[PDB]
Design a protein around this ligand. Structure first.
Ligand SMILES: [Cl-]
Length: 228
């Protein structure tokens, strides 16, 4: 049978993202909108900085900016925590360590509000260098493909996730961002606790030629794998 969580994702779902951020005291807000099509693992989103100029590079926020839209193969359906927690939702927490620089800590609440999948995020960044690659804006506007590794965390009725992102720096080098993540259901109901597996991401960043506000257009495809 198809679960109630699965059923919510069988079509195209509107997405709303709202973030409040503070990185080394630079305060900013971002709003995002678009659509997710989980059957195809497809995300299409546009983000706008509503407070003026974004004080960090847009690529550093890509991972923060709805893993319930991942395409899970039929044979791996019993391993899809994210959809199983819906519609009541889940809280995602991350620490993201930028090598030789500062760190972000994020808390995101992801749930349905009517037909819209909403993610409300608070991001706090500290210990950044004033002329490091982040606050000095030295990162290229592009994105590499990566795998995201998932395991159950029974004691929390959720999952633990870890992965490394390599951001290309303008001089040809790379800025590593080590991600540690936990997700916990908001409701008290049963969720699917997965066997170890991963999600494969591909991402493309672009600009809306008619948009004068600071913004990012993101197209992402996400597929679960590792169990066959
Ligand atoms: Cl940027």
């Amino acid at each position: 049978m198809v679960s109630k969580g699965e059923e919510l994702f069988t079509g195209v779902v509107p997405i709303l993202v709202e973030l409040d951020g503070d990185v080394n005291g630079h305060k900013f807000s971002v709003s995002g909108e678009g659509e997710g099509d989980a059957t195809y693992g497809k995300l299409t989103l546009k983000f706008i900085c509503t407070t003026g100029k974004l004080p960090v590079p847009w690529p550093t926020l890509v991972t923060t900016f709805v893993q319930c839209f991942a395409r899970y193969p039929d044979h791996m359906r019993q391993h899809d925590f994210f959809k199983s927690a819906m519609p009541e939702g889940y809280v995602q927490e991350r620490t993201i360590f930028f090598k030789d620089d500062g760190n972000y800590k994020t808390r995101a609440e992801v749930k349905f509000e009517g037909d819209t999948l909403v993610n409300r995020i608070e991001l706090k960044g500290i210990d950044f260098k004033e002329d490091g690659n982040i606050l000095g804006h030295k990162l290229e506007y592009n994105y590499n493909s990566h795998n995201v590794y998932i395991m159950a965390d029974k004691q929390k009725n959720g999952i633990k996730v870890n992965f490394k992102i390599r951001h290309n720096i303008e001089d040809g080098s790379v800025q590593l961002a080590d991600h540690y993540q936990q997700n916990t259901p908001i409701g008290d109901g049963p969720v699917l606790l997965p066997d170890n597996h991963y999600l494969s991401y591909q991402s493309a960043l672009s600009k809306d030629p008619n948009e004068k506000r600071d913004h990012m257009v993101l197209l992402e495809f996400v597929t679960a794998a590792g169990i066959t």
